[PDB]
Each structure stands twice: as structure tokens, then as C-alpha cells.
């Protein structure tokens, strides 16, 4: 199959997390197209993939704020082709914030509402992603299995 990973990451944690997910999926036979959000265009971005993995980190405080490069992508999520698309969502952040991995919640939320098939609950990394490598890998293994 073809899986599309797109991530918004500012200190490279979620990017690190995407790359490990990309590797797991590619080890299991998939063709994996991994792309930073800052380099993509929403209009038809999911066209042709069987699996779309979205990746974002959380900024902000009192309300949910998304990583700046992911914002135009989230604002045009209706134009990507999410309808019927097997999807799953991930993101790094810090549990001391009110909204722990809040962006993960706002994307899964917008997706569900656009008719996507959320194949697994999002992966919410707290702190250093390198300390949670088993979790990322395990979560990739589980998304592959469900689709
Ligand atoms: C100003 C500020 C606001 C933040 N807000 C949140 C938050 O609201 N929720 C959350 O889970 N983490 C929050 N974080 C945690 C960061 O997202 C955390 O560093 C995360 O790993 C960054 O992941 P990344 O290298 O993939 O970009 C915040 C950090 C800063 C500086």
C-alpha cells in the first residue's frame, strides 16, 4: 500500500516521531511518502493513499494552538480528500499544559467530522519522543494491523 505521513514539528520531536513511524510502515512493505506540513498543499493532498498519518505538536496555552506549519493544512482539511480515508493522528507535547496534545484532538475531531475513518486513537507523546520509541513503534504496528 501507499501511506502518506505529514507533520508539523518545530523542535523536531514530532518529525522524529514521524520518521520512526515512516520506518516501521516501510519495513512492513508500504511505500511511505513523508512530508513536512510546511511543504504541502491541502487541495487533493490525500488523493491516492490507502493510509494517511497526520502529525502535529501543540503550542498555545489557554486554548488549543497548533504548530504554525500545520495551520493552513488544518484550515483546509475539507479539501484534502479525507472522506472515507483511513486516517490516524499523532503528536508530541507536555502533560502540564491544560490541553495535553490538544492539536491531536483538534485534528482527529475535524477529521471525524469530514467523514474519515480514524483507524486508531491518536498517539500523544509527552516529553522526549526518543524516550518513548517503543510506544511510537508499537502504535505504528497497531495502525498497520487495523487497516
Ligand atoms: C509556549 C508553549 C506552549 C506549549 N503548549 C503545549 C500544549 O498547550 N499542550 C501540549 O501537550 N504541549 C505544549 N507544549 C509542549 C510542546 O509542544 C513540546 O515541546 C512538544 O514536544 C514539542 O514537540 P515537537 O519537537 O515535535 O515540535 C508547549 C510548549 C511551549 C513553548
Amino acid at each position: 500500500p501507499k501511506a502518506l505521513i505529514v507533520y508539523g514539528s518545530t523542535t523536531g520531536n514530532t518529525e522524529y516521531t514521524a520518521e520512526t513511524i515512516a520506518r516501521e510502515l516501510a519495513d512492513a512493505g508500504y511505500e511511505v511518502d513523508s512530508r513536512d506540513a510546511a511543504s504541502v498543499e491541502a487541495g487533493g493532498l490525500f488523493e491516492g493513499f490507502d493510509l494517511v498519518l497526520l502529525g502535529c505538536s501543540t503550542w498555545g496555552d489557554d486554548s488549543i494552538e497548533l504548530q504554525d506549519d500545520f495551520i493552513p493544512l488544518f484550515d483546509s482539511l475539507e479539501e484534502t480528500g479525507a472522506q472515507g480515508r483511513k486516517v490516524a493522528c499523532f503528536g508530541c507535547g507536555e502533560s502540564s499544559y491544560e490541553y495535553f496534545c490538544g492539536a491531536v484532538d483538534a485534528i482527529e475531531e475535524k477529521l471525524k467530522n469530514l467523514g474519515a475513518e480514524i483507524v486508531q486513537d491518536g498517539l500523544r507523546i509527552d516529553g522526549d519522543p526518543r524516550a518513548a520509541r517503543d510506544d511510537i513503534v508499537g502504535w505504528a504496528h497497531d495502525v498497520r494491523g487495523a487497516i
Side-chain angles (χ1 to χ4, degrees), residues 25 28 30 51 86 119-120 138-147:
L25 248 35
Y30 275 80
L51 173 62
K86 288 170 161 24
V119 301
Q120 194 90 354
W139 176 102
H141 187 89
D142 284 11
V143 157
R144 258 161 27 217
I147 70 166

Side-chain angles (χ1 to χ4, degrees), residues 7-17 56-65 67 90-104 124-130:
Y7 60 89
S9 189
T10 309
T11 75
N13 284 336
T14 310
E15 144 164 49
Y16 162 93
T17 314
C56 199
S57 64
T58 311
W59 304 97
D61 187 355
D62 260 29
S63 66
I64 292 172
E65 283 177 56
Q67 194 280 152
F90 68 87
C92 284
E94 285 303 339
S95 22
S96 51
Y97 278 87
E98 170 159 20
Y99 297 115
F100 173 56
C101 292
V104 183
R124 294 163 169 88
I125 307 309
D126 177 17
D128 195 351
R130 293 102 180 142

Side-chain angles (χ1 to χ4, degrees), residues 3 6 9-10 14 22 24 27 39 45 48 61 73-74 86 89 95 114 116 118 121 142-143:
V6 189
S9 189
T10 309
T14 310
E24 278 314 285
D27 276 21
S39 75
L45 189 66
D61 187 355
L73 180 46
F74 168 95
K86 288 170 161 24
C89 305
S95 22
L114 291 163
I118 292 292
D121 305 86
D142 284 11
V143 157

Side-chain angles (χ1 to χ4, degrees), residues 20-32 133 144:
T20 303
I21 286 153
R23 161 94 307 65
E24 278 314 285
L25 248 35
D27 276 21
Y30 275 80
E31 325 191 11
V32 182
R133 183 178 203 281
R144 258 161 27 217

Side-chain angles (χ1 to χ4, degrees), residues 32-69:
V32 182
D33 196 323
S34 205
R35 316 186 189 164
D36 186 315
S39 75
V40 301
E41 308 298 25
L45 189 66
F46 313 167
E47 291 281 336
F49 284 106
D50 337 279
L51 173 62
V52 171
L53 307 182
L54 301 174
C56 199
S57 64
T58 311
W59 304 97
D61 187 355
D62 260 29
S63 66
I64 292 172
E65 283 177 56
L66 274 32
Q67 194 280 152
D68 279 346
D69 307 309

